[PDB]
Nucleic acid binder design. Structure first.
Lengths: 74, 92, 124, 90
RNA sequence: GAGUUGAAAAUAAGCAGAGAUCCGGAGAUUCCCGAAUAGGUCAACCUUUCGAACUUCUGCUGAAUCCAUGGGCAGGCAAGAGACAACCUGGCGAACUGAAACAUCUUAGUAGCCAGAGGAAAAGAAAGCAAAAGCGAUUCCCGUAGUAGCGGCGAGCGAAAUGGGAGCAGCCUAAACCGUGAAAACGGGGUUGUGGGAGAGCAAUACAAGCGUCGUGCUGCUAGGCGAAUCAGUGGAGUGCGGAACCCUAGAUGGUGAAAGUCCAGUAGCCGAAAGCAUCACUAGCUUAUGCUCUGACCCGAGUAGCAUGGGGCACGUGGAAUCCCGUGUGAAUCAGCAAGGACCACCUUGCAAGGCUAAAUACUCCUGGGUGACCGAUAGCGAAGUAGUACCGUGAGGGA
RNA sequence: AGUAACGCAAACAUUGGUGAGAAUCCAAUGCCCCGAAAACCUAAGGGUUCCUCCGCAAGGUUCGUCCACGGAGGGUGAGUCAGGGCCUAAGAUCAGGCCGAAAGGCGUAGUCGAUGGACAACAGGUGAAUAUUCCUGUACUACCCCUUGUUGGUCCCGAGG
RNA sequence: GUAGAGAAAAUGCCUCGAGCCAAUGUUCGAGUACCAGGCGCUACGGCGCUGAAGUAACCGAUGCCAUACUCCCAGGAAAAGCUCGAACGACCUUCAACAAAAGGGUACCUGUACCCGAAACCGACACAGGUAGGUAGGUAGAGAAUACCUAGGGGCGCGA
């Protein structure tokens, strides 16, 4: 799925209004993204899939907090 | 451990004899006689329910499904045992 | 004839329940041959139909044998409904309505309401 | 007229009595072909007696305590091994 | 409480007052396919060393760095996996249509499909509404109002507050500091708001509530029983008719040759349960919180509110466009604060977010029980008053007498 | 309207039967027609139509004693033939893995899937319906049982084929 | 054989080495059956007993050697059985396997009827349609055409 493990950031249901006001449907989705963050508690990288907001959050709040608040590792 | 091709209870294996004139001819002809077995029977479980219920060693069990679902088993008793005289205690 | 088969609560036919009992000595109440004593012999309890002996006269006909031989006629006595029979005893020769008592023992029996006789009598 | 004896039988006698019941019932079925017609009186009783034996055994199994699944497995380990025996009647 | 071995009649022997048939509470068995489950499979089959995969628990413990791991192996136990009439929540979400055409809009967030769950679900205890006056969690009905308003200001959509009722019910956590710590973590204090909680003192707190242990006793449910009273003549048959009695806490119903309180099963009233299940009450345990006051200024749900930008829904169609949730990026303060009061700014008033739970009134019917019908009664009523989703037709979905 | 028709231009005729009834059933004798078939098997399909005895309401484009129609009984036997218990192609389903509003999509080892590869039976009898199935005679394959020996195994494996 | 360790794969030497390949062939299977023809029964089928000869020349295959061979380009499925052996791998003459008596016994499920160039299968009909494969006789013929016939089956189900 395209759902951030660490926050339920789903895509957004949003219609793209045109200039004549013609509304299509245009599903709109997060920039969750393949990286590999360095889980210190194992001295070792893990490969994740991260909504950038959640990436900022781990850094601000550390990683393991994010972990238990979503219960993800291993 | 050895199990039977299936669990049919053994006793339930044979149901009734066949009293047609043709089966009478076979009794009087080959040392055979006909049984009517339920569908989940074998040549092992029929071959081993006459050598252990009549006290007669059996030679063949030619069994056949029957166009309506039940099964029918010609049994050839070994020549030393003779068909009609055995069927006489059975009532045929 | 499906309109008159025995009625079935889940595999069984309802049995109704009738005051009359086998071996009963009854007077025919109203229908037809009104006022004629009899001994019931056979209760069809699902219809409440009761054949009392020697009363109802049905003149049937029976093909007897396989070559058309014989076939002499039989005269069968057919049903009569249950609400048309009251009880009588020869002593109080009179029709009555049934009832019930619990006598001094545990058991519980008939009791003709208009008289003092007991319908149940002995066990046999 | 009721069978206050099965509850007196232990397991073994109960069991072999089951097998013997099924045998004598095999013979009753066999008689139908040659039409010795006492069966209707006393065919069903035979059939309707093995059931009593089975019911008694299960209750006994129950006080002792075994799951239905376990009992089923136990039955199979017994159904699997059984040799047909001629009926006592000869 | 007698007769019975299902439908229709024998048939064959049986069973029963040394309770048969039968009616209830609890049980036991429940072949094979089907979640289908030992492995495969054209379903109801074949091969089988007899027994899934997912959690969980107990043990063996890959990889690299014998690290630590996860993964694998095994012995475990037995809990999730299917089904649904309609009602409900969520995700995706059309179109014919109305606008006398049609692209904004309307049908409509309807239909349908997928995903869950319940007998109800969802919502819910205030960062609410209000307006110089007051309210006080939610959810429905009335009514304000087809008003205010929105709207190619076209078709059309259309609130709410005050008012009246149905139903009422409030709690548990996150900090702050304390006792642990193989530095995660658990324990206890702490939860309220014109501001509480971390701080300072007793005359030995009790009443109150909830729950549970198993336990006790009525009340009902699942069998049932007793239960009043009449006959004659008429005519194939009487319950009608003419005559003559009676009952009525019982002229409610179904039958009975033709209609009847007095023929039958019954009904009012009354008695009744092993056992199982219900709605309550009580006897003994935990548990209840603000019994009070005062002077400091610690914490008061962090990548969240805001903002920019793209939207969705709000009765409200980007409009002065508030509140309400979302995609991208920046990204505050916390009480000599912050949000709302229809851009925004001041002053005042209300409420205090980013954690969670919770009964009722409420919508529903494939159904069960009780009753009722200015409802049908044989091309009507269920499509179906007999082997009716049957025969038949189609490869199939499906149609269907 | 008792009107068109009665489904090809192989072709019927007789004697004698059965019967209440014969052009229509049976048996002869004759004529005739197919014969790369209008013959005999067999895969598929059908699914009880096969056989025997009664029946003739409806069916048969006539008739009916007759039927593939109704009723009652009966019937199809494999170590070798075909398939499964062996193998795999196209394809299918795919643990884990990856991807995706949900369902689900792609995909590896595995597992199925034969139309294919491994593998062992022929002749003659019998009989209302079965016969490479039953009987007679002679064969073949697989697993045990017995004897002497060597003690060395079977798998995963690497090769021929 | 040996050289880079079993086994092929590659190297070289060499082998009373010159024959190997396959349908037919012979014998037994079958001193047997089988059989035309005889003599009786008979509700005219049926059975009974007997039962002679059972050999050569021709032609010929759209079976067989046969994935012989030649020629081609467009270059023709896989995996098991089956045969050889290394870490001679867990296991070990107690559970093992081979020459082996080719000696004795045993031998699992499912289909089998009937139609099948069809009156019963698919075209709604007992439809002058369609339906894979197998066998393939005589005369004339180049021939599986055609024409007339064996084997076998039928005379087409309204008639005069």
């Amino acid at each position: 799925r395209r759902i951030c493990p660490f926050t339920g950031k789903k895509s957004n249901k949003a219609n793209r209004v045109s200039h004549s006001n013609h509304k299509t449907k245009r599903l709109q989705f997060v920039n969750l993204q393949y990286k590999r963050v360095w889980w210190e508690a194992g001295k070792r990288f893990v490969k994740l899939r991260l909504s950038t907001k959640a990436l900022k959050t781990i850094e601000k709040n550390g990683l393991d907090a994010v972990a238990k608040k979503a219960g993800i590792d291993l | 451990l050895k199990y039977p091709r299936r669990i049919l209870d053994v006793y339930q294996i044979l149901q009734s004899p066949i009293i047609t004139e043709a089966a009478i001819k076979n009794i009087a002809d080959e040392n055979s006689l006909l049984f009517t077995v339920d569908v989940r029977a074998d040549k092992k479980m029929i071959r081993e329910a006459i050598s252990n219920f009549f006290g007669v060693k059996v030679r063949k069990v030619n069994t056949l499904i029957r166009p309506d679902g039940t099964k029918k088993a010609y049994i050839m008793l070994n020549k030393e045992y003779n068909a009609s005289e055995l069927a006489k205690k059975i009532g045929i | 004839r499906w309109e008159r088969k025995d009625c079935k609560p889940n595999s069984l036919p309802k049995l109704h329940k009738r005051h009359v009992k086998v071996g009963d000595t009854v007077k025919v109440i109203s229908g037809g041959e009104k006022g004629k004593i009899g001994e019931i012999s056979k209760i069809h309890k699902h219809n409440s139909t009761v054949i009392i002996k020697d009363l109802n006269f049905k003149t049937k006909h029976v093909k007897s044998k396989e070559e058309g031989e014989q076939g002499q006629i039989i005269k069968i006595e057919a049903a009569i409904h249950s609400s048309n029979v009251m009880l009588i005893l020869k002593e109080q020769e009179v029709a009555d309505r049934v009832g019930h008592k619990i006598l001094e023992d545990v058991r519980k029996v008939r009791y003709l309401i208009k008289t003092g006789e007991i319908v149940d009598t002995p066990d046999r | 007229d009721e069978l206050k004896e099965l509850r007196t039988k232990t397991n073994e006698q109960l069991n072999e009595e089951i097998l013997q019941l099924k045998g004598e019932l095999f013979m009753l079925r066999l008689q139908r072909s040659a039409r010795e017609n006492f069966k209707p009186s006393d065919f069903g009783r035979m059939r309707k007696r093995v059931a009593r034996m089975l019911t008694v055994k299960r209750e006994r199994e129950i006080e002792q305590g075994v799951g239905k699944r376990l009992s089923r497995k136990l039955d199979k380990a017994w159904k699997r091994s059984i040799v047909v025996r001629p009926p006592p009647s000869l």
